[PDB]
């Protein structure tokens, strides 16, 4: 039963390093390439190289020579991946993949050589943002009349909203956020409620960013 | 060594999907398909040309022959909806190269027009020297958008910020894009207008100061 487990997501500045890991288990390590795939977000799959499990020996793609470091440390059957002088670009998950035919099959040349297992995944973000809490804008409404909040500037994802504490559920969207060119996150919530904004219907959205401890009830009114 | 893969294939749920990956003398190399549901890491779904690893159902099958391999999924579901890949291996460079994907849509429900929301800046936000324009794109089918803005009857490129869409709990599509001006410019404008294009239509929505 083959497996391939990978470190967590990792969130790091440009001009930093990243160590990826990659435990295999349920077949022996030293008997099998271990290739590694990067995905940059909504693109292909790009390979990057492979590495020999038995003398650390590694081969790069075109264009992932330099920056990119393959090594092991076999007596835990774990395959690293290091990025030096990160740049916003290198944002991708980074996929491990384990290689068959394994290197002492005859048939490697004629069959040889696609990605049996893989690894879930590992996202590394590369951003010179720094933690910061959103401001909160109430979005007015102009027989149904649509309201919200835009939750401006936060940063680092995620962020809750709740209307009326709760109680409020039916008529409600929470967009996925936006990552701006400043490298800061937005996003809007809608309710489509009857039009009955009776002088005291209350819609209040309630905001939660938790990295910064940020926690605001914004009333909207028409 | 180049891969050559169509971006995009529609199919009917039930019908034959046939997706094509192109290569001088792909025949002579062993040519490997990888499915990639969104959020998912890839899986192997045939290797060497037509063999399916051990749980990968006989719908799935595949081809490769002089210039171009074949991957052919038979009564497609729903549950194919995904990116493929094809990939060989170079025994030249010794270098693994994978197509650039196709994306297959199994069109599990009819055409739906996107529905629009434009918000003008609060009263909060211009106190705090700042204004956004908020466009919520809803329930569209497919997946796809194209978003512009117009102030004036001109285009406004910069300060747009646009999402991928996203899929909703109905297996409809929502996405936002967000204008950003600073007051001044939002009033120096009678109107400012954004124009979501979905299947060569566009869904427009005006806003004043
Ligand atoms: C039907 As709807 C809540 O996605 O506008």
């Known amino acids: 039963e083959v497996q391939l487990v990978q470190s967590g997501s990792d969130l790091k500045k440009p001009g930093a390093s990243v160590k990826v890991s990659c435990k295999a288990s349920?077949?022996?390590?030293?008997?099998?390439?271990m290739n590694w795939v990067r995905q940059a977000p909504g693109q292909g799959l790009e390979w990057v190289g492979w590495?020999?499990?038995?003398?650390?020996?590694?081969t790069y793609a075109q264009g992932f020579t330099g920056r990119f470091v393959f090594s092991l440390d076999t007596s835990v059957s774990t395959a690293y991946l290091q990025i030096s002088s990160l740049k916003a670009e290198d944002t991708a998950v980074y996929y491990c993949?384990?290689?068959?035919?394994?290197?002492?099959?005859?048939?490697?040349?004629?069959?040889?050589?696609?990605?049996?297992?893989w690894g879930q995944g590992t996202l590394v973000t590369v951003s010179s943002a720094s933690t910061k809490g959103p401001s909160v804008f109430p979005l007015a409404p102009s027989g149904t009349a649509a309201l919200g909040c835009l939750v401006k500037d936060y940063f680092p994802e995620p962020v809750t909203v709740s209307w009326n504490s709760g109680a409020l559920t039916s008529g409600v969207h929470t967009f996925p956020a936006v990552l701006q060119s400043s490298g800061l996150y937005s996003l809007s919530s809608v309710v489509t409620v009857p039009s009955s904004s009776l002088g005291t219907q209350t819609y209040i959205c309630n905001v939660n960013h938790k990295p910064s401890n940020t926690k605001v009830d914004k009333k909207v009114e028409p | 060594y180049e891969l050559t893969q169509p971006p995009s294939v529609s199919v009917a749920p039930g019908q034959t999907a046939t997706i094509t990956c192109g290569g001088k003398?792909?025949?002579?190399?062993?040519v490997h398909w990888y499915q990639q549901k969104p959020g998912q890491a890839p899986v192997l779904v045939v290797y060497?040309?037509?063999d399916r690893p051990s749980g990968i159902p006989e719908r799935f099958s595949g081809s490769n022959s002089g210039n171009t391999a074949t991957l052919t999924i038979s009564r497609v579901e729903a549950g194919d909806e995904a990116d493929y890949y094809c990939?060989?291996?170079?025994?030249?460079?010794?270098?693994?190269?994978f197509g650039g994907g196709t994306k297959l849509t199994v069109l599990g429900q009819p055409k739906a027009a996107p529905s629009v929301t434009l918000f003008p800046p609060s009263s909060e936000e211009l106190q705090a020297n700042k204004a956004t324009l908020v466009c919520l794109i809803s329930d569209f089918y497919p997946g796809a958008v194209t978003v512009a803005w117009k102030a004036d009857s001109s285009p406004v490129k910069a300060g747009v910020e646009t999402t991928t869409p996203s899929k909703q709990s109905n297996n409809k599509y929502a996405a936002s894009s967000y204008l950003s001006l600073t007051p001044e410019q939002w009033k120096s404008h009678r109107s400012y207008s954004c124009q979501v294009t979905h299947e060569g239509s566009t869904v427009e929505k005006t806003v004043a100061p």
């Open positions: 349920g077949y022996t390590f030293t008997s099998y390439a």
């Open positions: 003398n792909i025949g002579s190399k062993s």
């Open positions: 060497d040309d037509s």
């Open positions: 590495i020999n499990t038995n003398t650390g020996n590694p």
């Open positions: 993949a384990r290689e068959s035919p394994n290197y002492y099959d005859s048939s490697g040349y004629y069959s040889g050589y696609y990605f049996d297992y």
């Open positions: 990939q060989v291996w170079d025994s030249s460079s010794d270098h693994r190269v």
